[PDB]
Structure 1
């Protein structure tokens, strides 16, 4: 009951943390910028983790008996939260790029309305993708619980060709490669901005301070994304060995859970990364707790 204990420990933090973030934003209007609209999507997504995803993960670990629709939803619900985080992290990257790249058109393009729109779309696409195995791409009953109910086991009910080709490479590796490519242009151009301002006949510390603060935000965003890939790659890398290399000793269970726990931990690092990186956030939380 140790794995269970740790999974519950995370669920608590994942909730308290991200919920604290959403509350801090709804309280302090200085954090209600268009940018943080996506951060809210990240929070809500990472909240349902300690709310449903973890509970489901703890249940499916031992396996149970249920229909295909019910057994798939429970097993593929984590793919939805993990996929939504992809769109949110990708949007934030693009956003932090638009600001530094074209500061003027930033307010003209990056609107509070389009934000809510994109988010909605992202979630829809998250359910479409995350629950693709429920569209027919599954191994329900492929060569106990009785007729009608199927032994709900993640590896047995969920195809490997999906989580590898479709899910991992396309819906994870590609995005992360796009995001990484974005931050490449972000910091590459950001340092050029400082070089042009390094050869200016005027102080203009307003533009420098602002530029440095926009870079501080883009950097903080880069750290949030990095921890995502750092906490999900291991779990996918394991599935790459199992699939592509049937000979390669199938990953043990003790190692399997560690990769799974590492993914559920990702939802917790965010609340703490804001309180540290952003001096505006930490002062917001500090107040809520006291009062």
Structure 2
């Protein structure tokens, strides 16, 4: 229960990269006026949620790995808060995919259908679903009725306290039957379905060229969605597949602790790549990113630049 320092520090690294990249995304929309359109509300939402994952969710996740002494229901609330915030991250990422779906399939009415007000509707829905799902264990679907005294004793916890571990407060059936399907499998299948429809649009345009600018938009879009989906599956499936193994094999010895830490960390790394890489693949975002990091360097190197120039003067 002591914990692994290697895990803690790698987990801390991800939090920083998640905050850096997504502040970068949001900063870029505030400065650049070209980036201030409806389509980017979905990108800003996702970036905002990823920040909260770095600031709030990952620090909370670190705590839950240590098995510190606390009231079971306090421990459950922290685990639930990790679930809500990561869920919002997933759902707001889905919103980007549904947006691109409408944009490519119904390009005419898109501008009349996907308005700034309706975009905030969708954003709110993302957060309603996140709370409803991640807080579900609060309503009674939890392991707090059956505390572990033997483990609580070994950690030297006072009476009425337990070792705060994730798998000790959050039930595996909740994780497997509700959380995995609602939060991971459905969104993944929906996003994969969106990618397959954009790909097929590109294939139809390409087949027409076998007889003598929309094709470039669709090929770029399909690539962007392949990245999102590929990364999302690589980041989220290992941890949840592990959870299924744990649930369906109660007699099996538990999956190694190093694999657990790797999978948890892997799931958190979705908040640094999604949707940074997506935004980074729009030139307008990419150029604005340069102006910001540029101005950060021509203002941090100044003490050493002035020193070197003065050192050469009297050389």
TM-score by length of 1: 0.89
2:108 aligns with: 104
| Larger mean Cα displacement after TM superposition, 167-176 or 112-121 | 167-176
Deviation at 1:33, TM superposition (A): 2.5
Deviation at 1:91, TM superposition (A): 1.8
Contact 1:17-1:271 at 8 Å conserved across structures: no
Deviation at 1:45, TM superposition (A): 1.3
Deviation at 1:149, TM superposition (A): 3.7
How far apart are the structure 1 equivalents of 2:82 and 2:53?
A: 8
1:170 aligns with: 182
Return closer, same or farther for 1:93/1:154 CA change in 2, 3 Å cut-off. Answer: same
**5+ residue gaps, structure 1:** 201-208
How far apart are the structure 2 equivalents of 1:241 and 1:193?
A: 44
Return closer, same or farther for 1:222/1:91 CA change in 2, 3 Å cut-off. Answer: farther
Return closer, same or farther for 1:274/1:122 CA change in 2, 3 Å cut-off. Answer: closer
Deviation at 1:213, TM superposition (A): 2.3
Cα deviations by residue, 1:102-134 (Å, 9 ceiling, x for unpaired): 110111111111111110121011011011111
Contact 1:57-1:75 at 8 Å conserved across structures: yes
Cα deviations by residue, 1:42-95 (Å, 9 ceiling, x for unpaired): 111111122111111111111123334421221122211222233222222221
Deviation at 1:197, TM superposition (A): 6.8
Please show how residues 66-81 of structure 1 align to structure 2 within 5 Å.
66-81=70-85
Deviation at 1:288, TM superposition (A): 1.1
Contact 1:97-1:218 at 8 Å conserved across structures: no
Return closer, same or farther for 1:264/1:102 CA change in 2, 3 Å cut-off. Answer: same
**5+ residue gaps, structure 2:** 148-155, 296-315
Deviation at 1:190, TM superposition (A): 3.4
Length, aligned pairs only: 283
Give the alignment partner of residue 161 of structure 2, picking from 146, 149, 153: 149
Contact 2:25-2:47 at 8 Å conserved across structures: yes
Structure showing greater radius of gyration is 2
Contact 2:103-2:110 at 8 Å conserved across structures: yes
Contact 1:98-1:106 at 8 Å conserved across structures: yes
Deviation at 1:4, TM superposition (A): 2.0
SS in 1 for 2:251: coil
Return closer, same or farther for 1:51/1:263 CA change in 2, 3 Å cut-off. Answer: same
SS in 1 for 2:69: strand
Cα deviations by residue, 1:116-168 (Å, 9 ceiling, x for unpaired): 11101210110110111111100014155345444321101110000001110
How far apart are the structure 2 equivalents of 1:57 and 1:12?
A: 14
How far apart are the structure 2 equivalents of 1:21 and 1:133?
A: 33
Please show how residues 41-52 of structure 1 align to structure 2 within 5 Å.
41-52=45-56
Please show how residues 148-227 of structure 1 align to structure 2 within 5 Å.
148-196=160-208, 209-227=213-231
